[PDB]
Structure formats: C-alpha cells, structure tokens
Amino acid sequence: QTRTYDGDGYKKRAACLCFRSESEEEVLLVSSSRHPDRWIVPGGGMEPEEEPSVAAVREVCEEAGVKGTLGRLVGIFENQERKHRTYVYVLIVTEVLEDWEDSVNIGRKREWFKIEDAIKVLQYHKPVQASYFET
Ligand SMILES: O=C(N[C@@H]1[C@@H](OP(=O)(O)O)[C@H](OP(=O)(O)O)[C@H](OP(=O)(O)O)[C@H](OP(=O)(O)O)[C@H]1OP(=O)(O)O)C(F)(F)P(=O)(O)O
C-alpha cells in the first residue's frame, strides 16, 4: 500500500469508531500487529487520491472485518510523536464478517469495549486514540 502525506510531511490516515449501535455505548477495537496484547482503534493509511471517508471504511473492513453505516467526521487528530494526521469517523456496525483479511493474514483480533474501557486500554500506548472519544 503506497503511503501518503500532507504538505507538512505528516502521514495521512483514516480510522472509524465502530459502534455496535446508534447509542454509541460499545466500540470495536483491534489488536496491534507489532504488539498483539495491545488494543488500537482500527484505521490506517490513505492511498493516493483516496477520500478520507473511503479510506476509513476500507481500513476497518481490512483490520476489523466489519461494515456498516458511515456517520459523521468526529475530527482530524495529529500525533506529533509519530507525525501522522488521522481523520476519525463514526461507523455504526451492521455486518460482522467471520474470516476477514487481517484475521486470515496476520491473526489480528477484535473485541467490543464499553467507551470508558476503550479509553482505559488506549491511554498508555495510544493517548491520541483515547482522545478520539472525548467528543
Ligand atoms: O510502529 C508504530 N506504529 C505503527 C502501527 O502500529 P500500532 O499503531 O498498531 O502500534 C502500525 O499498525 P499495524 O501495522 O501494527 O496495524 C502501522 O500503523 P498504520 O498502518 O495503522 O498507519 C505503522 O505505520 P506504517 O509503518 O506506515 O505501516 C505505525 O508506524 P508509524 O506510522 O511510524 O507510527 C509505533 F508508533 F512505533 P509503536 O510505538 O505503536 O510500535
């Protein structure tokens, strides 16, 4: 996959907060490839000329094996340490697929979390991802 960058050299990413329902009480996290006992928000790099909302949906299909109704842009989040900029969308999950690309290819796991518990497991390694939930 070709990595893309903003004019200031930050890597362009898109991600979804993948909720079980329109009540947005439970969210899907996925395991880190580099560190499988860590949870992250599914998302990843935008391809050349790829709209952020398209990249967001593609990446959560690839990583989390879900599909659903794309909701609002929550915001654009910089990670100054890692020099990336992430567009973060709400996705209401309508389809949970059992044998998805990163499960098959790299053994990636997924799990539902209550919002408060998602914030807790992201805080240590992924504080910017915890902040996606601050509304
Ligand atoms: O390696 C790092 N983060 C990498 C992602 O790993 P995690 O964010 O899951 O820890 C990795 O995601 P996976 O391949 O593990 O799913 C992918 O992030 P992305 O593909 O979601 O963007 C990759 O980016 P690439 O190297 O561009 O693939 C990221 O590295 P940085 O983009 O340098 O943070 C890190 F920042 F150095 P760490 O301190 O988290 O180890």
Angle, CA 36 vertex, CA 30 and CA 90 arms, to 5°: 15
* Ligand 1-lining residues (CB < 6 angstroms): 3, 11, 13, 32-35, 40, 43-45, 82, 84
Sign of the Cα pseudo-torsion (53, 124, 34, 38, in order): negative
Cα 74 to ligand 1 centre (Å): 21
What total of structural domains would you count in the chain?
A: 1
Residue having the nearest C-alpha atom to atom 23 of ligand 1: 44
Q: Burial letters for 86-122: b for 16+ Cβ neighbours within 10 Å, e otherwise?
A: bbbbbbbbeeeeeebebbeeeebebeebeeeebbebb
Cα 93 to averaged position of ligand 1 atoms, centre (Å): 24
**Which residue bears the tokens 């539902």?**
112
Question: Structural domain of residue 37, as residue ranges?
Answer: 2-135
Angle at 12 between CA 43 and CA 49, to 5 degrees: 100
Catalytic annotation, residues? 62
Q: How was this structure determined?
A: X-ray
Closest of 47, 36, 52 to residue 103, by C-alpha: 36
| Residue 26: Cβ-neighbour burial (10 angstroms; 0-12, 13-18, 19+) | middle
Helix (H) or strand (E) holding 14, with range, is: strand 11-19
